[PDB]
């Protein structure tokens, strides 16, 4: 390969793991790396934020141990009622839709902190400290756990604004997950428009957009002009 | 009053999902005597409560 | 014979009589060596837990004392309305029915005892207390009496859970008995999938445990590349 090609591959699987979902491990590392932006900073305010973003990724972090318990005490109980496959299909119905419905609550408790998080980050009005790499790292971190929490529930649509939010921060406009969801987040939104028979002005909008990251995700992990960027171009045409 | 108000007896030998049967078939219809009478005076209790107040 | 095939024949024979149905000179040795076992373990539990045991296993040995002197009081009376076969035959049954029910409170009454002595044994939470010798030459003695109470009444598909958990106690794995129950009751179960049309991955999951149980208990009693080893290997490939 090139040694442009071999940087890329490098960056790419680092992206992937800056997208990975939430565990212990990547959550002492973020928190010791974002820890460290509050270091430098000395900012009451950037600290605030960072105490209210940790309380919403504690929130996730507390459902994700809550839904492995729930999920084992049900599997630990005796089934006596449970001799045909409906009951079964009953109970595991029981099952899924109490757990998304702890989940929905969760993810709401930390989209209070995360916006708590960013309504501090709003109280830095200095244009100097606004543009500081510590600003804008734990204000991406906000918005990626954000837009991850809405994500991981299908509620795509909301995470177009916080998607397009991260992008426009410190080179974020070249990471590959970042336009993986946004291109699918778009393609959810032009099939609602499909499936509900909605205008065609969104149709082609939500089209154009989902088209447009599905482009720039295939340039940045595969180069422009590769034999996967070429197939796209036809593709999109 | 729950279900352990007495002997809670499901199921019958032959294939089951679970790891338990039913136990003598004569003291299954018993035991269902049983049940009924433990709650059956319960509630009088209460009625019997009503009827204080 | 080798020194193991000397050994290996004086613990086969020292099992079945391990394995023996229950009598007073058994009953004797076992609850004398009990007690010496629990005035060393000193633990009110372990006490307790020997005592319904014990209360358990006196069910056992006074129901078959009912069942010589029941029998006996039957043998005894003048039948006057025994003039016909099918009458004999009628009250054969009436006799084999009326032992049979009271064998059954027996042993209803014999495992509540058993339970209860479960249930004190779980009370004794220290590790260092569970992994005493005392604690599962008990624990052992009581499975053992509720997968033979049971056995003894055909009540086979209920001695494997109970068989499972003897195994898995302080080499007990090793005794030929307990693999040949596990292998005859997971038998029965296969032939009960058999009879009543049941589906075929409870068919090959019975059958799987019967051959794996099978082949251990011939491994254990006759040695490995025995005659009897070979055999069971290449019937069940």
Redo the contacts between chains.
Sequence with gaps: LTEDQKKKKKEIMEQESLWKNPDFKGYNKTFQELHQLSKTFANNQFRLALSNYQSGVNTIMKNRDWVEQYRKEEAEK??????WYWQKVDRKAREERVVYREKMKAKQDALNYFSKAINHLDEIKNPDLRERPEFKRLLSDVYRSWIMAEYDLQNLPQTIPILELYIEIDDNEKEYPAHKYLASAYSFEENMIKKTKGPDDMLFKYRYKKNVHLLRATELKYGKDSPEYKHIVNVIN | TMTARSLNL??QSGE?????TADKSNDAIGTLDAALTRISKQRANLGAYFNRL
């Design positions: 005796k089934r006596l009622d449970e001799k | 499901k199921g089951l999902l679970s790891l338990s």
